[PDB]
Amino acid sequence: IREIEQERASFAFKVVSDIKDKYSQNKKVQGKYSSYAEKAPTIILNNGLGATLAFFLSKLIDDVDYKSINPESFGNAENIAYAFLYKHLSTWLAEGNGKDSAFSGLTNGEDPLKYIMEKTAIDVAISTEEALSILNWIKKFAKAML
């Protein structure tokens, strides 16, 4: 339960750094990502993980595939920040830090939203807790870097 925290922190630092790198001169994008990262756990708490992912989906389709998302191809800061947070959260649940690391995800590459629709209630609960935990780490680095 300690090594998993380090893995989360490593991922969180990486994705926030990518945000700050690509949009260094764009404070609006950085600020939007930060706000959404803070609001995200709340949306999950009050609506569940499934609905939250669906809510992100509406901010972007043919199929539910986080891989196919391209955050940089959007017009405004709101959609760019949403697409990034959505992909980050989905990537973590599906891939972790890669298959060369301790944590390689929970869903084995499957999109978390479709995963929720197919697997058991237990599978959904662990995905919910894990989602809250990674967002909690993203919030830390967001406040300190963005």
Binding site: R2, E5, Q6, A9, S10, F13, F141, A144
Partner: protein
């Protein structure tokens, strides 16, 4: 302890509490100077929660992002908004300065060493 550090020239500070605990911190001599002139010292002696959180969780911090996690804990524990921004920048700089003079293999052990030092000198039972 002190003479076993590469390059030596080290102060080894130990606190043996009456209850039984034994805290040890290895520091370079310049740490003493930096700390006494620091805003961090005046703020700590103006606490245990800041020190606890860092010591309890430093092993979960990412190797590549230690500095950023330090920024966070300063934001969370150090606070008008004008003075708040200034104090956070200053204290973070002091912590980074102090870390330069802590004896340790890596940044993590340096953080542990520093906040172990802070835990010793803020012990209300030892410094009433």
């Amino acid at each position: 302890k002190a003479k076993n550090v590469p390059g030596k020239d080290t102060l080894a500070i130990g606190l043996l509490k009456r209850s039984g605990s034994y805290y040890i911190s290895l520091v370079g001599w310049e740490l003493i100077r930096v700390f006494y002139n620091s805003e961090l010292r005046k703020k700590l002696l103006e606490g245990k929660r800041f020190i606890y959180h860092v010591l309890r969780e430093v092993d979960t911090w990412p190797k590549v992002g230690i500095d950023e996690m330090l920024k966070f804990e300063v934001i969370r524990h150090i606070r008008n908004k004008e003075e708040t921004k200034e104090l956070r920048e200053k204290i973070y700089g002091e912590i980074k300065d102090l870390l330069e003079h802590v004896r340790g293999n890596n940044e993590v052990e340096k953080v542990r060493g520093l906040f172990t030092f802070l835990k010793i000198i803020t012990d209300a039972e030892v410094f009433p």
